Design a protein around this ligand. Structure first.
Ligand SMILES: CCC(CC)CN(C[C@@H](O)[C@H](Cc1ccccc1)NC(=O)O[C@H]1CO[C@H]2OCC[C@H]21)S(=O)(=O)c1ccc(CO)cc1
Lengths: 99, 99
């Protein structure tokens, strides 16, 4: 589809057998999702933006479905105020910016 | 243009008569630039990101050209980690997400 940017580009995703809402975010290198207790191992990480850094848990090779488009890659989990789908997954669903 | 997302979507912008590089950021409601001198009145404002809130100077109705496309809108100036073009200006240049 084509998504205009009058409002936040929010979509439904499926991860860990759960549905959540997330932003298609071209400004995020990697995907960052709200606290969820995923199975498996992880590596600590700190990621920075406006206001500073938050601590997150890095999970690799996580399956995510975005608007029925399947992808698999790194997901960072932590106390983020917003779920963002980053470029690591946006590329996998064929997402471009166009003007 | 059509812009893929294997790399950061960085473009050249012109603001206040000077060229800069900035990130097309669909996850940003607003446009936030790193500290700089800008001709125009401004007002103190607060904006929140992944890591908390920062103080910015709000410049309204600023001319800014993004990748050859003209816009006139609000530009926030402050200690953002990187120059970002948010949705307030992405809409003006006719930018959409497509997949
Ligand atoms: C370094 C460039 C960006 C910061 C500038 C990076 N961000 C993605 C960005 O889209 C965030 C994503 C975002 C969206 C809502 C709330 C927090 C973070 N948007 C954002 O900060 O926008 C602010 C300006 O306009 C306003 O409207 C939203 C907040 C304000 S981020 O969330 O901090 C971020 C995301 C993933 C990683 C790991 O790669 C590291 C940082």
């Amino acid at each position: 589809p084509q998504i205009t940017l009058w409002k936040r580009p929010l979509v439904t995703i499926k991860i860990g057998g759960q549905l959540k809402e997330a932003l298609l975010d071209t400004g995020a290198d990697d995907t960052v999702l709200e606290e969820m207790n995923l199975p498996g191992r992880w590596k600590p990480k700190m990621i920075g933006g406006i206001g500073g850094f938050i601590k997150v848990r890095q999970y690799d090779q996580i399956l995510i479905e975005i608007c029925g488009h399947k992808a698999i890659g790194t997901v960072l989990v932590g106390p983020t105020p917003v779920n963002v789908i980053g470029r690591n997954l946006l590329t996998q669903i064929g997402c471009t910016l166009n003007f």
